[PDB]
Design a protein around this ligand. Sequence first.
Ligand SMILES: C[C@]1(c2nc3cccc(C(N)=O)c3[nH]2)CCCN1
Length: 350
Amino acid sequence: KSKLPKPVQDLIKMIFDVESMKKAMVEYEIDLQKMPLGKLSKRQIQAAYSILSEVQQAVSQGSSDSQILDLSNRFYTLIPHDFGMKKPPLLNNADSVQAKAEMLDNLLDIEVAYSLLRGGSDDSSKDPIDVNYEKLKTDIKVVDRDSEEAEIIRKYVKNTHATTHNAYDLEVIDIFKIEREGECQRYKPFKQLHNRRLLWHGSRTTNFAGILSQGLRIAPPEAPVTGYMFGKGIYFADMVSKSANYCHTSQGDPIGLILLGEVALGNMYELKHASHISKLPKGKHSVKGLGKTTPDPSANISLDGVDVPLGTGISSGVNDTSLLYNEYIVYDIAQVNLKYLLKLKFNFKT
Ligand SMILES: C[C@]1(c2nc3cccc(C(N)=O)c3[nH]2)CCCN1
């Protein structure tokens, strides 16, 4: 039997749950009879991204519905969808491309989780929780609820829940301090960079085995750059609720996971509207999508020499922006050092 703390054991059980992976796939309209969890491969997902890029080229070139039909059909051939003997809906716009790009990002992490579960050794004398913990190559510790780091984290959660995201409230269940093997070494060129911030990253529970084993990643070269507001980078928020929305929790699944990462932002390229970029302008280290609301800058605190924007939301003074809240994007995976993982209970008021 495992000697790991019970919250860590529960975390391991949640992220390696095969039934949750199947549920995420069903939620995406994937046909599990034609494409089961065991049949998903990087190769297949990459080919589907490539086809999605062919679809975005046709939609931006102003091709007709009759013209896009074969391209749309091609995507469904690669990623079978649950439509029986009926015709699938046509993928003929930016919204459908974005929705499918997001789905493939999820399938990529699910494939990683399933590969870990299948690519190791079998020893019934060992607790499978300990076995699965070892596959993450991540030191996971429970943060003491009475510690200063827990107090700062709780304040960050308490103060940055947006009024527009009030259909639920958040209860912090557990706070974990995480250390991905080799990440400290990888982050070394950015460890003293100016404008290092502690930011939120929300994701579906089914993506966490991938995130902990591989770190936060950028969509592959095959992925459509127009499938993401600021292109192919790693996205963070300074508002807990903005990132919590990306956990995709519900009344039937109200427990989610959120990350706190130290992000080396450096010289920020400030944008108010979509810019589908792959690379940054010279001398820029990140993109800051300017929100109408920002955490109060006077309330900014330092945790282990990193800025924590835990102030309550105030007007940024930014006019005519597509964003209600800030978002930060890095285009080099080495600019992220994951620090904490929170298990949240979503209390839906609706
Ligand atoms: C829509 C998209 C995304 N935009 C975000 C902005 C702020 C935070 C997050 C997050 N996950 O915490 C975001 N995720 C684009 C790339 C992945 N999904």
